[PDB]
From a paper:
To stabilize the p53-DBD/BCL-2 complex, we used a fusion strategy. However, we noted that a BCL-2 construct (BCL-2#3), featuring a shortened α1-α2 loop and certain surface residues replaced with a BCL-xL sequence, could be expressed in high yield and was suitable for crystallization. To improve the success of crystallization and to ensure that the linker does not affect protein interactions, we linked this BCL-2#3 construct to p53-DBD via three different glycine-rich linkers. In particular, crystals of the three BCL-2#3-linker-p53-DBD fusion proteins were successfully optimized for X-ray diffraction, and determined at resolutions of 2.3–2.7 Å in the P 21 21 21 space group. The RMSDs for superposition of these three structures are 0.2–0.5 Å. p53-DBD and BCL-2#3 had similar interaction modes in these three structures, indicating that the linkers did not affect the complex structure. Two loops of p53, the loop linking strands S5 and S6 (S5-S6 loop) and the large loop L2, insert into the BH3-binding pocket of BCL-2#3 which is composed of BH1-3 domains. Two hydrophobic residues of p53, Leu188 and Leu201, penetrate deeply into the hydrophobic pocket of BCL-2 and interact with BCL-2 residues Phe104, Tyr108, Phe112, Met115 and Leu137. Around the hydrophobic core, Arg107 and Tyr108 of BCL-2 form water-mediated hydrogen bond or direct hydrogen bond contacts with p53 residue Asp186. Asp111, Asn143 and Arg146 of BCL-2 form direct hydrogen bonds with the backbone atoms of residues Leu201, Gly187 and Val203 of p53, respectively. In the crystallization and structure determination, we used glycine-rich linkers to help stabilize the interaction of p53-DBD with BCL-2 or BCL-xL, whereas the two complexes showed different patterns even when the same 16-residue linker was used.
Residue numbers in the entry:
A (entry chain B): 7 to 32, 90 to 202
B (entry chain A): 95 to 288
Write the structure that this text describes.
């Protein structure tokens, strides 16, 4: 079950990075709606994602707790599908930003961080709100 | 049993509302009439509301938006969306489907269903104007036309914008009328006539 959610991270990041030139990796319709919802969010909230980035100084030495602090602010008032989509999109923005700075190794780290935060804090909410197929029913 | 207050309160920070100088030309998505204090818009289109301030409020300030019915006959009824648009799947993931007012382009938005008043509201953090500008601009969305029968059903409403501190104490209040319709231009020049 936790391994099933690690896949959603990697598939989301791999397709986001494949939309640019970079190639990377370390039913399908659930990932289809997530990816398009996420493409919507980078237009609507480009300035928020830019702020979240600047407060997370993304360096080779950046620890996980720094990333979990920024993401925990995103869910401060509660967890919903919109904020969950922003979470996937923000992670993808960080992976795209890292390979654009000649720091491709940092992608593998961001993916791990997203998988951990997903299982540790978001997954219990996801199961109690109709699972992932409740998300395809609304979006 | 009580009604929110419409009374203007510029407060200690000189709080005042502003709007764009859009005309009443046809196919205009949202326009404001100073003489009527009434904004005209069509469903789901961005209506810019700018916040003008004489003294920048401290960090942690909030901007809340809430709708009330204008006629004293209906002021005690909660302004909610029609049944057709509640079940309508137009949700952005952030706004609950029953709310009439939304805010677009702000990840930090939050929606309140008051556990005592049952009145809807939407609130964002207050932030000072962008460097070089002079006012904070907020983009609201109205998710149901006033003509919608079964919801508003031809009843004019007001939007109340309030500044509050971290704990929700009033720092400023302003209000303006709103009509959500198909032709905001022709309908504006009409209401301006009578
Ligand atoms: Zn309606």
């Amino acid at each position: 079950p936790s391994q099933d959610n690690r896949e959603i991270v990697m598939k989301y990041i791999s397709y986001k990075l494949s939309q640019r030139g970079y190639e990377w990796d370390a039913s399908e319709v659930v990932h289809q709606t997530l990816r398009q919802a996420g493409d919507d969010f980078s237009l609507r909230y480009r300035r928020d994602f830019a702020e979240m980035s600047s407060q997370l100084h993304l360096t080779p030495g950046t620890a996980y707790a720094s990333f979990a602090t920024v993401v925990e602010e995103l869910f401060r008032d509660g967890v919903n599908w919109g904020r969950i989509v922003a979470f996937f999109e923000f992670g993808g923005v960080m992976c795209v930003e890292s390979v654009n700075r000649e720091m491709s190794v940092l992608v593998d780290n961001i993916a791990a961080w997203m998988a951990t935060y997903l299982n540790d804090h978001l997954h219990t909410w996801i199961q109690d709100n109709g699972g992932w197929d409740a998300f395809v029913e609304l979006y | 049993s009580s009604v929110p207050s419409q009374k203007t309160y510029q407060g200690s920070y000189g709080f005042r509302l502003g709007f764009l100088h859009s005309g009443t030309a046809k196919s205009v998505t949202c326009t404001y009439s100073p003489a009527l204090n009434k904004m005209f818009c069509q469903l789901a289109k961005t209506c810019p509301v700018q916040l003008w301030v004489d003294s920048t409020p401290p960090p942690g300030t909030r901007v809340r938006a809430m709708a009330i019915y204008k006629q004293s006959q209906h002021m005690t009824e909660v302004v909610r969306r029609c049944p057709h648009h509640e079940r309508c799947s137009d949700s952005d993931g952030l706004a609950p489907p029953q709310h009439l007012i939304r805010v677009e382009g702000n990840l930090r938005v939050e929606y309140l269903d008051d556990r005592n008043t049952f009145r809807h509201s939407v609130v964002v953090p207050y932030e000072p104007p962008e460097v070089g500008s002079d006012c904070t601009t907020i983009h609201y969305n109205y998710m149901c036309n006033s003509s919608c029968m079964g919801g508003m059903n031809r009843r004019p409403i007001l939007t109340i914008i309030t500044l509050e501190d971290s704990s929700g104490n009033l720092l400023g209040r302003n209000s303006f009328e709103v009509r959500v319709c198909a032709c905001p231009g022709r309908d504006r020049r009409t209401e301006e006539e009578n």
